[PDB]
């Protein structure tokens, strides 16, 4: 060991080559695999990192561990760079990539000891990667079986399992799933992406949690300014006028200050300043609007006309909310009334129709509910519970659940997780290798066997018998694939994974363990790239 | 102002008594000057001199604490000299050592600084020293 | 791993040899051989080293048989001459005036790079760039006179040759910058336009307001006089070398030059000045006192070209005897990687075209010429007598190292590949060889796997010279 | 169950070490107790040698390596700032108490039981001290008792020959400053001076003050009777 | 560098056990003394658990984490500094054989530890007894335990009353189904700091239902008593203001220098009018206030305080509700701090005062402490802090648990009984927790010099067959009834100790390797 001090080839430093380098690289990769093993899966165990000063940190985040892990080896740093690249591209799953790369390198070294040239191993692994990518593409699916089925409901329950809302998850998960599914839209240029921000959360103390309501419309986080205007106008049919132009008392001139002691001149100046906004308001009243939403606010003086006209004004409205309300109600937010040389709101042209608009009182800040739009597809969640503490906890839990469900939905091409992909690829590549030969069969078989590390590590981290779980998973996948030529399946199904909580084999699609196809594809491709890069090093010189 | 230093400076043995000796000064407009004597009436600069060995725990901890202080105490001078390049036969038994100078004179001689506050010294232990 | 802690991973023989820091004086002959191959051939630095090693092994075996090193060197020289003759006999000649053959060779060379679909433009670009200076029957042509100028922006398809010379710096973007000038003379300036700045101790002493005014007027007058001296020489393009001690062109100097209708380009590095010394055909000016017309060049027009953000100054129509058509190919690309890869690919294409120019024609790759030459030499050596026959047989056996190495590195059966090539060569000639694309022995000629004959010829010659030099060393002594 | 750069005593090792240190300190200060005790010789290394018998001075000047001995010496030193004597008595009592406590602990007696017994015995000893003391009279003619007290104090520190010289000196010096009245006693009223090139027995008492500086003229009177001080 | 297999778990468990064993003897009135030896010649015989855990250096990261946990608990809770470490170490030691000998995965142990934590909390709730948090006599009797036998034993009678009054002033007893239970939101560190007033006696100390300010009137011609006070807080100073960028003053004639004063007067008058627009009675400015500003504010009929630290305003906004506005021009009428009690500045002990109290519940107060000397004041301050921590622990839950290890023994017995019926692999860690709970009574028996085996067996038998109020007597060392002897500890301390120890044990068990990294 420690090959050095060569009697010949007097160079500027030590030099090694061959099996020694291969074994050293394998040992370094195994050392890194030992560090990253416990961080795989939600049931993984924390690891502690200690610096040279005396400080330390504890965390099970594979990316953080790899970033802070001190690796000093020419081949070891390849895995660190691989993990950093995966974090830049994917941002998660680096532990699985590192484990797969280590297993692949170990099996490649085993093949090399079996008189298999490294180039043949690399070619076989690349062929296996291409076949695995093809299989992954063949086993992809979009966002289906999400409405009316327990697919995202289990996701919400899992996210809510660590919060007080877990007790009423059976209903809150349905609420959030429906709210996020309804808001499906093409986004921009047919991107097919759900809204980034949606589903406002409100708090109430009435009834109980099971009575939580989904508002069929939008909600504005503001008040109605003066209390003289009705809080609910035209229940049978209420129209909304959305205007961006400010109704605040205008100035006689931007660069002129009013310093006048004559009552008549003061009255004239005030008349002009209030009359600008009064004309702006009249252009809305003449349109028959019952609720007016102003983004830049409304002054008290101009609210007199609305009060006399029984019109409810709203100040400090959000631009996005008003735009969405107008679009859903068939109207459009008016950016400005200064069309050409005139000043008007185009009466009846930018007024939306709603079934009911009412100022709803809730805990903390109040809001105005706009219900009955022509087409909005959005909703707001009203929280009910025993007390305010439970309401706030449920609000935070709803935020987390909405975030995770939105992340799941935005991925329009996903593949089942929890080891389904790894086992399916293992079976498919095992079948494929029996039809290639040409010195590539061994490499393909070893590559296929390598993917079995991920399910084994997950089972080990779950405190279960990994052998039995992995064998059952392989049997299920083999049974599912064997019936493919028969074009008939009654008890044979695919997409089975490993349940790390109950220690059983379950369908991950229904269970709620899915990951985007890009994540798995990039993970496998980068793991193979790192393994090949490590294998390509057969000479090391240290000057 | 003046925000004079802002960082820990490396010292070589030939300049030890230049960079430490230079505690004995102020600058223009920081004090009174008089007839045939341009020296400020006030005191000089607090200089914190760290005699370090890279192999020792406290030396590594202090390198962190000294630079962290330097980043806030802009007006205080912090310097570091490998202990083995400061004192002929520097003994490991005294390591690390902090000597505080002021106005060219010695103010503190803190020896085996691992006991100057917690073994895992925090900026709280060092800022409590720097205000004494 | 370097002494600085940097880790370098690469399969390039040149970089490996350079970073190996070979300490043995004789082993440095391999680095010298690689450098010579790069200067002449530009490729195959691994093949020359492998051939040198095989010849060294053959020489060791011959010495074990009782053969003196001098006879080994002489017989190796004779065998190398015969092998070069055989190789030249089988070469497929090409004509530099036939752009199609050069374009095909350039495309074949470029196919190994990431940029492949755009090779249809890169290949003719290099072909034309080389042909503009090599024409036909020009013997050896040095490609180092061709400059590759990279600029951020554009895409791969954006490129230009410029038959004259191209500068890498932009014109003055401040007020007064003409940005172009017709009927321009370009000179290389090593000094800077600034007030008196003695290299020794100096200072300005003022005892009155009048003295300060006089000093300011003197400085402005010195700047104006420098600008007027530059103008009087008829230097319409000013190339100021980059400097950090003196302002390249003072604002007042810039205004004076603008009033004098002088194009100003500053922030010029030493490499650009050295390149322009041949591209422009002019001479550097040590100081303003030596600034005259004889030190200036000529050009029909000098202007900054900005089509899609190129902003590159070019000189055309030099029409000077000293100046030569040093074609400066402009490389454009939005990303730095694009321009770097384009530069590397164009360098490889230029090396291939240079190999063709020095010795017209290509030979089949994959070790086919090595196998054929080895077989022919083995057959011929039977007619020789004495130590020469043994040395020729050993040389022929050693020649098969290259195909053996190619087979081993390709993951193929080492012994079987050599036998297959030998059997196939009994019917074909310089047609079948090792190809990584087919993972076996195939018709390299039909696979468009072709390499210049000059590469193999130079490899053989350098290996012979290196083995002769190594064998000729009989003692080592210290000298200080 | 340990950390680097540290050493700890487990089981009863700490008790044994403390007892050994206390016994060592007692043996160090055992020989200098009472008027029949001996004197200790201290060398500072600079050429100065001190021959001292007082426990407080010996403990303060002497360097102590055993941490338990250092603690015992520091605790006993409090006697100087409170009563001015008894340091040797404190050390001997601590040493013997620790000897007996260790002897009982070897038999299985828990240390807390011994501590409780010591506290009870301390309370009983305080009661005995209260019942056993003798009340001194306030008579101004108690000079004989003061002489006896001074002799008792001096015999412990002197060779029994200088006692005859120091006893009357100390008695008179203390009595003169504190008259036969309530008032108060302050030993700062008694000045201490040292003179060289004189016999040890020459020590005398001066009613008033002595000035360091003398005359610088041969014609000045050697003695002045009933002088007016300017 | 790297540790794999059971070795890392063994190392962590050994470090935890080493940390626990040091303080194992720090519990009970019979706690033994310890010797701390520095590398120099100095040493101490301190027996304080916090001091022992603070001055002890540990190299193993797990020991450092345990020490940090204990130090954090020393401030989070008033007691349990050593109990947490001892309990966690005992639990880890008991669980060690299962992880090493029984080959039990750490996840099972962690889950069982969490379930045992829940069960122990339930048992502690079951065994606790209620207390009268409304009757002052019961609170005084309970709090006298942490006040007597100390330097403040002489004034204990009034110390208990002062501490209880302060805690009640900061205590908010509210219960409803709308806002939930506030948990009394008791904060002693920030809004209960004791003000040391030289002179007087402890019996003269009073509790101020608000914030006490030591800033006197900035001008003698200023009101010193307002029956309808209103506080307004500002930051921007009331003086000459320069431009945002470089400002230069150019004056030609000497008499023209009064232009700067005129500009300052104009700006200060405008700012003072803006401040007075909100009908204030006291103006507090964090930055300096010019004399002209003081005069203008006095003209408006209000007091002025300048150069007031942010610490005073932070509590003023709590007890007066005044809103602080950085810029004077941005002051709003709603920022005025109405509902203020008084501005009385009555002097006590030749010291300046400014009372901002009221009959509200701002969850903030000030303690006006008096004493005959500075040392007495400092000692009383420390003892009052301790007593108020104890009172906060008691009042946060109107119940107490028996002391002397009775609670721990009862918890162990009930946990064993429940684990007997679980019928699962997790039963082993439950029994380990139940056995580890016996650490406290073992320590009490050992410190008392009794039989570590027979006494513990008798106590366990009494708990199993008798009541759970039996414990170890501090002085006699025998098994006696805690209620009869008045031995008790707050339930909050026990719950927090158990929860923290079990959570720390779980966290330590989670770590299965220590690797180098920066």
CB A368 within 8 A of CB A314: yes
CATH number at residue D173: 3.30.260.10
Closest by CA position to C457, among listed C50, C83, C21 = C83
In B, minimum Cα distance to A54 occurs at: B120
Tell me which residue has tokens 């009177």. Answer: D221
In the set A29, A87, A94, A499, the catalytic residue is A94
φ and ψ of B112, to 5 deg: 50, 65
Residue A52 sits at the chain B interface (C-beta within 8 Å): yes
Burial (0-12, 13-18, 19+ Cβ within 10 Å), D160 = exposed
The rounded distance, in Å, linking the Cα atoms of A519 and A89 is: 9
The rounded distance, in Å, linking the Cα atoms of A265 and A268 is: 5
Residue D74: partners with Cβ closer than 8 Å, 6 or more residues away: none
DSSP-derived letter for residue A250 is: P
The rounded distance, in Å, linking the Cα atoms of B106 and B116 is: 18
Instruction: Answer positive or negative: Cα dihedral of C33, C36, C40, C43.
Output: positive
D146 token code pair: 């003061």
CB A249 within 8 A of CB A301: yes
Burial (0-12, 13-18, 19+ Cβ within 10 Å), E318 = middle
DSSP-derived letter for residue C144 is: G
Residue E476: partners with Cβ closer than 8 Å, 6 or more residues away: E448
Neighbours of E71 (CB within 10 A): 14
CB E55 within 8 A of CB E71: no
Angle of helix C45-64 relative to helix C28-40, nearest 10 degrees, comes to 140
Query: Cα C390–C392–C397 angle (5° rounding)?
Result: 95
Residue E60 sits at the chain B interface (C-beta within 8 Å): no
Please tell me the distance in Å from C436's CA to the nearest CA on chain A. Answer: 11
Superfamily of domain C1-94+361-480: GroEL-like equatorial domain (1.10.560.10)
DSSP-derived letter for residue C171 is: P
Q: Chain-centre distance of CA D182, in angstroms?
A: 27
Quote the longest CA-to-CA distance of chain C. Answer: 102
- Concerning whether A95 is annotated as a catalytic residue, the answer is yes
Strand blocks (E) in A23-65: 47-50, 56-59
E343 token code pair: 């501005």
Question: H/E element holding B97?
Answer: strand B97-102
> E179 contacts in A (CB within 8 Å)?
387-389
Same domain? A230 vs A339 = yes
Query: Cα E177–E181–E186 angle (5° rounding)?
Result: 155
| Residue D153 lies in domain | 137-207
In E, minimum Cα distance to D108 occurs at: E449
| Best of E104, E517, E518 to mutate (most A CBs within 10 Å, chain A) | E517
3-class DSSP state for residue B20? Answer: coil
Half-sphere exposure of residue D168, counting CA atoms within 13 Å on the CB side? 7
Contact E61 A65 (CB under 8 A): no
Residue B94 sits at the chain E interface (C-beta within 8 Å): no
C384 token code pair: 């020789």
Residue A72: partners with Cβ closer than 8 Å, 6 or more residues away: none
The rounded distance, in Å, linking the Cα atoms of A248 and D127 is: 93
The rounded distance, in Å, linking the Cα atoms of E193 and E196 is: 10
Residue D146: partners with Cβ closer than 8 Å, 6 or more residues away: D171, D174, D175
- Give CA separation, C365 vs C377, C425, C432, C469, E257, in Å: 19, 14, 8, 29, 95
Strand blocks (E) in A244-364: 291-294, 312-314, 351-354, 356-360
Burial (0-12, 13-18, 19+ Cβ within 10 Å), E10 = middle
- Give CA separation, C153 vs A26, C157, C332, in Å: 44, 11, 6
| Residue A329 lies in domain | 216-376
Query: Which of D2, D4, D110 lies closest to E18 in CB terms?
Result: D2
The rounded distance, in Å, linking the Cα atoms of C393 and C391 is: 5
Tell me which residue has tokens 């000047």. Answer: D61
A297 token code pair: 């606010």
Contact E512 A70 (CB under 8 A): no
The rounded distance, in Å, linking the Cα atoms of B125 and E215 is: 32
Residue at a domain's end among A376, A398, A424: A376
Closest by CA position to A40, among listed A506, A455, A467, A518 = A455
Residue A74 sits at the chain C interface (C-beta within 8 Å): yes
Burial (0-12, 13-18, 19+ Cβ within 10 Å), C379 = exposed
Half-sphere exposure of residue C35, counting CA atoms within 13 Å on the CB side? 7
φ and ψ of D42, to 5 deg: -115, 135
The rounded distance, in Å, linking the Cα atoms of A512 and A407 is: 13
Contact E180 A49 (CB under 8 A): no
Same domain? A480 vs A512 = yes
Contact E449 D1 (CB under 8 A): no
φ and ψ of A411, to 5 deg: -75, 100
CATH number at residue A104: 1.10.560.10
Same domain? A296 vs A405 = no
SS (H, E, C) E456-506: HHHHHHHHHHCCCCEEECCCCCCEEEHHHHCCEEEHHHHHHHHHHHHHHHH
Alpha helices in A69-226 (DSSP H): 76-89, 94-113, 118-138, 152-160, 169-182
Chains C and D touch (3+ CB pairs under 8 A): no
- Concerning whether A355 is annotated as a catalytic residue, the answer is no
- Contacting chains of E (3 CB pairs or more, <8 Å) are A, B, D
**DSSP string for A171-192:** HHHHHHHHHHHHT---TTTT--
Contact A54 B120 (CB under 8 A): yes
Q: CATH classification of C164-324 is 3.50.7.10, yes or no?
A: yes
What's the reported resolution, in angstroms, to a tenth? 4.6
Closest by CA position to A398, among listed A203, A220, A218 = A203
In total, the C-beta contacts within 8 angstroms joining chain A to chain C are 41
Contact E35 D67 (CB under 8 A): yes
In the set C43, C45, C441, C461, the catalytic residue is C45
- Contacting chains of B (3 CB pairs or more, <8 Å) are A, E
B2 prior amide bond cis, ω within 30 = yes
DSSP-derived letter for residue C6 is: -
> A439 contacts in C (CB within 8 Å)?
411
The rounded distance, in Å, linking the Cα atoms of E505 and E16 is: 9
Residue A237 sits at the chain C interface (C-beta within 8 Å): no
The rounded distance, in Å, linking the Cα atoms of D92 and E49 is: 32
Closest by CA position to A122, among listed C439, C440, C115 = C439
Contact D111 E32 (CB under 8 A): yes
CB E308 within 8 A of CB E316: no
The helix, strand and coil proportions of chain C, stated in percent and rounded to the nearest 5, come to: 50, 15, 35
Report the DSSP pairing between strands A414-416 and A514-516: antiparallel
Residue A185: partners with Cβ closer than 8 Å, 6 or more residues away: A193, A194, A195, A377
E391 token code pair: 């009172």
From first CA to last CA, the distance across chain A in angstroms is 19
Residue E71 sits at the chain B interface (C-beta within 8 Å): no
CB C326 within 8 A of CB C163: no
Chains B and E touch (3+ CB pairs under 8 A): yes
CB A274 within 8 A of CB A302: yes
Please tell me the distance in Å from B115's CA to the nearest CA on chain A. Answer: 15
- Give CA separation, A369 vs A289, A295, A395, E282, in Å: 16, 16, 19, 43
Tell me which residue has tokens 């009101």. Answer: E223
In A, minimum Cα distance to E507 occurs at: A46
What method did the depositors use to determine the structure? Answer: cryo-EM
Please tell me the distance in Å from B71's CA to the nearest CA on chain A. Answer: 20
Same domain? A420 vs A349 = no
Q: Give the domain ranges of chain C.
A: 1-94+361-480, 95-163+325-360, 164-324
Contact D112 E58 (CB under 8 A): no
The residues with which E214 forms a beta bridge, in sequence order, are none
B104 token code pair: 């060219």
Same domain? A111 vs A164 = no
Closest by CA position to E474, among listed E411, E408, E409, E405 = E405
SS (H, E, C) chain D: CCCCCCCCCCCCHHHHHHHHHHHHHHHHHHCCCCCCCCCEEEECCCCCEEEECCHHHHHHHCCCCCHHHHHHHHHHCHHHHHCCCCHHHHHHHHHHHHHHHHHHHHCCCCHHHHHHHHHHHHHHHHHHHHHHCCCCCCCCCCHHHHHHHHHHHHHCCCCCCCHHHHHHHHHHHHHHHCCCCCCCCCHHHCCCCCCCCCCHHHCCCCCCCCCCCCCCCCCCCCCCCCCCCC
Contact E39 B119 (CB under 8 A): no
Q: What is the CA radius of gyration of chain E?
A: 30
Same domain? A496 vs A362 = no
The rounded distance, in Å, linking the Cα atoms of B102 and B99 is: 10
Structural domain count, chain A: 3
Residue E226 sits at the chain A interface (C-beta within 8 Å): no
In C, minimum Cα distance to A124 occurs at: C411
Which residues have a C–N gap over 2.5 Å right after them in chain D?
A: none
Residue E244: partners with Cβ closer than 8 Å, 6 or more residues away: none
Closest by CA position to C193, among listed C216, C168, C215, C225 = C225
Q: What is the CA radius of gyration of chain B?
A: 15
């Amino acid at each position: 060991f420690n090959n050095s001090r060569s009697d010949t080839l007097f160079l500027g430093g030590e030099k090694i080559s061959g099996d020694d380098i291969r074994n050293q690289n394998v040992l370094a990769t195994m050392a890194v695999a030992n560090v990253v093993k416990s961080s795989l899966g939600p049931v993984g165990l924390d690891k502690m990192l200690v610096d040279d000063i005396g400080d330390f940190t504890v965390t099970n985040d594979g990316a953080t561990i790899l970033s802070l892990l001190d690796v000093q080896h020419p081949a070891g740093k390849i895995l660190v760079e691989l993990a950093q690249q995966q974090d830049r591209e994917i941002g998660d799953g680096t532990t699985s990539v590192v484990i797969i790369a280590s297993e692949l390198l170990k099996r490649a070294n085993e093949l090399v000891k079996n008189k298999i040239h490294p180039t043949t191993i690399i070619t076989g692994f690349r062929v296996a990667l291409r076949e695995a990518i093809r299989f992954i593409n063949e086993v992809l699916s979009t966002s289906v079986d999400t409405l009316g089925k327990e697919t995202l409901i289990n996701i919400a329950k899992t996210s809510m399992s660590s919060k007080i809302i877990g007790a009423d998850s059976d209903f809150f998960s349905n609420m959030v799933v429906d709210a996020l599914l309804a808001v499906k839209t093409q986004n921009s240029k047919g991107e097919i992406k759900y809204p980034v921000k949606a589903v406002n959360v409100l708090k109430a103390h009435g009834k109980s949690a099971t009575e939580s309501l989904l508002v069929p419309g939008y909600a504005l986080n503001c008040t109605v300014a003066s209390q003289a205007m009705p809080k609910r106008i035209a229940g049978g049919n209420v129209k909304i006028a959305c205007l961006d132009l400010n109704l605040q008392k205008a100035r006689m001139a931007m660069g002129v200050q009013i310093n006048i002691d004559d009552p008549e001149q003061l009255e004239q100046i005030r008349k002009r300043e209030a009359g600008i906004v009064l004309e702006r308001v009249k252009k809305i009243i003449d349109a028959g609007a019952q609720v007016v939403l102003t983004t830049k606010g409304i002054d008290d003086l101009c609210l007199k006309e609305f009060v006399e006209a029984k019109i409810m004004g709203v100040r400090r409205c959000k631009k996005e909310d008003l735009r969405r309300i107008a679009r859903a109600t068939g109207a459009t937010l008016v950016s400005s009334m200064s069309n050409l040389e005139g000043e008007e709101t185009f009466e009846s042209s930018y007024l939306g129709l709603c079934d009911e608009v009412v100022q709803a009182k809730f805990s903390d800040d109040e809001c105005i509910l706009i219900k009955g739009t022509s087409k909005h597809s959005s909703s707001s969640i009203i929280l009910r519970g025993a007390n305010d503490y439970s309401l706030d906890e449920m609000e935070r839990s709803l935020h987390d659940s909405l975030s995770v469900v939105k992340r799941t939905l935005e991925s329009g091409n996903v593949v089942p997780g929890g080891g389904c992909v790894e086992a399916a690829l293992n079976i498919y590549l095992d079948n494929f290798a029996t039809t290639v030969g040409s010195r590539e069969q061994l490499a393909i078989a070893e590559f296929a066997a390598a993917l079995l590390i991920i399910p084994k590590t997950l089972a080990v981290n779950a405190a279960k018998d990994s052998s039995e779980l992995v064998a059952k998973l392989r049997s299920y996948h083999a049974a599912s694939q064997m019936a493919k030529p028969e074009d008939v399946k009654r008890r044979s199904y695919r997409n089975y994974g490993l349940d790390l909580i109950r220690g059983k084999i379950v369908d991950e699609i229904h269970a709620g363990v899915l990951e985007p196809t890009i994540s798995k594809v990039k993970s496998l491709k980068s793991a193979l790239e790192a393994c090949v890069a490590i294998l390509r090093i057969d000479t090391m010189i240290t000057v | 102002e003046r925000s004079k230093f802002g960082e820990v400076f490396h010292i070589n043995k030939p300049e030890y008594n230049k960079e430490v000796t230079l505690a004995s000064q102020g600058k223009k407009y920081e004090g009174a000057q008089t007839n045939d004597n341009g020296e400020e009436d006030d005191g000089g600069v607090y200089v914190f001199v760290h005699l370090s060995l890279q192999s020792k725990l406290q030396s590594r901890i202090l390198s962190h604490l000294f630079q962290s202080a330097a980043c806030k105490f802009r007006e205080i001078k912090f310097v570091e000299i490998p202990a083995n390049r400061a004192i002929e036969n520097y003994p490991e038994s005294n390591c690390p050592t902090l000597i505080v100078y002021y106005r060219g004179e010695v103010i503190k001689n803190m020896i085996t600084l691992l006991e100057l506050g917690g073994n895992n010294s925090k900026m709280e232990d060092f800022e409590d020293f720097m205000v004494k | 791993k370097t002494s600085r802690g940097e880790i370098i991973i690469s399969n390039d023989g040149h970089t490996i040899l350079k970073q190996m820091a070979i300490l043995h004086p004789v082993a440095r002959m391999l680095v010298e051989v690689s450098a010579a191959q790069d200067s002449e051939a530009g490729d195959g630095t691994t093949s020359v080293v492998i051939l040198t090693g095989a010849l060294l092994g053959a020489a060791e075996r011959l010495l074990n048989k009782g053969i003196h090193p001098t006879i080994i060197a002489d017989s190796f020289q004779s065998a190398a001459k015969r092998s070069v003759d055989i190789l030249l006999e089988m070469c497929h000649k090409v004509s530099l005036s036939d752009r199609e053959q050069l374009v095909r060779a350039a495309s074949t060379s470029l196919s190994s790079k990431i940029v492949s679909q755009y090779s249809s433009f890169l290949a003719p670009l290099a072909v034309d760039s080389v042909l503009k200076i090599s024409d036909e029957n020009s013997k050896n042509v040095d490609l180092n006179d061709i400059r590759l100028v990279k600029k951020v922006g554009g895409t791969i398809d954006d490129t230009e040759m410029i038959d004259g010379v191209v500068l890498t710096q932009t014109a003055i973007k401040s007020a007064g910058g003409p940005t172009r000038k017709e009927k321009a003379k370009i000179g290389l300036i090593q000094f800077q336009i600034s007030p008196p700045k003695p290299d020794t101790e100096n200072n300005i002493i003022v005892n009155d307001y009048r003295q300060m005014d006089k000093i300011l007027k003197e400085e402005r007058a010195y700047l104006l006089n420098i600008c007027k001296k530059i103008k009087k020489a008829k230097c319409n393009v000013l190339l100021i070398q980059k400097s950090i001690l003196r302002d390249a062109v003072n604002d007042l100097a810039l205004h004076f030059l603008s009033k004098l209708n002088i194009m100003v380009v500053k922030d010029i590095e030493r490499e650009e000045i050295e390149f322009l010394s041949k591209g422009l055909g002019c001479k550097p000016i040590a100081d303003i006192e030596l600034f005259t017309e004889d030190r200036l060049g000529s050009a029909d027009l000098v202007e900054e070209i900005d089509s899609d953000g190129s902003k590159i100054v070019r000189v055309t129509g030099i029409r000077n005897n000293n100046a030569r058509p040093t074609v400066s190919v402009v490389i454009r690309g939005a990303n730095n990687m694009i321009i770097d890869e384009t530069e590397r690919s164009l360098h490889d294409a230029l090396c291939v075209i240079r190999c063709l120019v020095k010795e017209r024609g290509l030979i089949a790759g994959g070790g086919a010429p090595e196998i054929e030459i080895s077989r022919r030499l083995s057959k011929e050596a039977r007619s020789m007598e004495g130590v020469q026959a043994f040395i020729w047989q050993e040389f022929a056996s050693a020649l098969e190292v290259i195909p053996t190495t190619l087979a081993e590195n390709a993951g193929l059966n080492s012994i079987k590949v050599v036998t297959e090539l030998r059997s196939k060569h009994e019917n074909g000639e310089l047609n079948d060889g090792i190809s990584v694309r087919r993972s076996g022995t195939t018709n390299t000629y039909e696979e468009h796997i072709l390499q210049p004959v000059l590469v193999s010829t130079s490899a053989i010659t350098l290996a012979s010279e290196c083995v002769k030099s190594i064998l000729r060393i009989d003692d080592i002594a210290f000298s200080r | 169950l340990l950390n680097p750069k540290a050493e700890s005593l487990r089981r009863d090792a700490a008790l044994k070490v403390n007892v050994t240190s206390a016994e060592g300190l007692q043996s160090v200060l055992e020989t200098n107790l009472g008027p029949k005790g001996t004197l200790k010789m201290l060398v500072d290394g600079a050429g100065n040698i001190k021959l001292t018998k007082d426990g407080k001075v010996l403990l303060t000047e002497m360097q102590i390596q055993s941490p338990t001995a250092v603690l015992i010496a520091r605790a006993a030193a409090a006697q100087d700032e409170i009563t001015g004597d008894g340091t040797t008595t404190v050390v001997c009592l601590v040493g013997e108490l620790l000897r007996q406590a260790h002897r009982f602990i070897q038999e299985g007696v828990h240390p807390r039981i011994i501590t409780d017994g010591f506290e009870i015995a301390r309370k009983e000893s305080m009661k005995f001290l209260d019942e056993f003391k003798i009340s001194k009279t306030n008579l101004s003619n108690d000079r004989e008792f003061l002489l006896q007290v001074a002799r008792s104090s001096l015999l412990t520190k002197v060779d029994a020959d200088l006692t005859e010289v120091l006893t009357p000196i100390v008695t008179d010096a203390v009595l003169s400053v504190y008259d036969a009245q309530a008032d108060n006693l302050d030993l700062h009223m008694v000045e201490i001076m040292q003179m060289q090139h004189l016999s040890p027995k020459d020590t005398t008492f001066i009613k008033g003050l002595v000035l360091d500086h003398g005359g610088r003229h041969p014609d000045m009177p050697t003695r002045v009777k009933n002088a007016y001080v300017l | 560098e790297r540790t794999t297999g059971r070795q890392a778990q063994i190392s962590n468990i050994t470090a935890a056990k080493a940390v626990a064993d040091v303080i194992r003897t720090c519990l009970g009135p019979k706690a033994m003394l310890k010797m701390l030896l520095d590398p120099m010649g100095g040493l101490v015989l301190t027996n304080d658990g916090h001091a022992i855990l603070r001055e002890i250096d540990v190299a193993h990261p797990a020991a450092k984490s345990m020490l940090e946990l204990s130090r954090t608990q020393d401030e989070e809770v008033g007691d349990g500094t050593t109990t947490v470490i001892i309990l966690a170490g005992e639990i880890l030691a008991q669980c060690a054989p299962y992880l090493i000998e029984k080959n039990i995965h750490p996840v099972i142990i962690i889950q069982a530890l969490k379930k045992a934590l829940t069960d122990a909390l339930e048992v502690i709730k079951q065994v606790s007894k209620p207390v009268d948090v409304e009757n002052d006599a019961a609170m005084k009797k309970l709090i006298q335990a942490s006040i007597g036998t100390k330097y403040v034993i002489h004034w204990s009678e009034k110390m208990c009353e002062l501490a209880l009054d302060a805690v009640k002033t900061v205590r908010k007893d509210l219960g409803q189904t709308v806002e939930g239970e506030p948990n009394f939101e008791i904060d002693i560190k920030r809004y209960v700091r004791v003000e040391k007033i030289p002179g007087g006696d402890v019996l003269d100390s009073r509790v101020l239902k608000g914030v006490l300010l030591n800033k006197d009137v900035v001008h003698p011609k200023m009101s010193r008593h307002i029956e309808n006070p209103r506080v307004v807080l500002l930051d921007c100073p009331l003086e000459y203001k320069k431009g945002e960028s470089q400002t230069n003053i150019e004056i030609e004639k000497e008499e023209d220098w009064n232009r700067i004063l005129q500009i300052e007067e104009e700006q200060v008058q405008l700012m003072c009018e803006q401040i007075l627009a909100v009908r204030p009675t006291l103006v507090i400015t964090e930055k300096g206030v010019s004399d002209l500003a003081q005069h203008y504010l006095l003209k408006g009929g209000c007091s002025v305080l300048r150069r007031v630290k942010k610490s005073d305003n932070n509590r003023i906004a709590r007890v007066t509700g005044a809103t602080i506005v950085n810029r004077v021009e941005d002051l709003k009428e709603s920022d005025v701090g109405t509902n203020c009690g008084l501005f009385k500045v009555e002097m006590i002990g030749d010291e300046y005062f400014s009372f901002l109290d009221n009959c509200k519940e701002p969850k903030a107060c000030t303690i006006m402490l008096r004493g005959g000397s500075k040392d007495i004041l400092n000692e009383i301050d420390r003892n009052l802090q301790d007593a108020m921590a104890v009172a906060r622990n008691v009042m946060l839950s109107p119940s107490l648990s028996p002391g002397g290890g009775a609670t721990e023994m009862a918890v162990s017995v009930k946990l064993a009984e429940k684990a007997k019926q679980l019928e699962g692999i997790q039963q082993w860690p439950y029994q380990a927790v139940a056995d580890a709970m016996e650490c406290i009574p073992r320590t009490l028996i050992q410190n008392a010099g009794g039989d570590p085996i027979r006494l513990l067996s008798q106590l366990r038998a009494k708990h199993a067959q008798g009541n759970f109020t039996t414990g170890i007597d501090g002085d006699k060392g025998k098994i006696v009834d805690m209620v009869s002897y008045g031995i008790w500890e707050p339930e909050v301390i026990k719950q927090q100790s158990v929860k923290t120890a079990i959570e720390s044990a779980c966290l330590l068990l989670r770590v299965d390797d220590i690797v180098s990294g920066v």
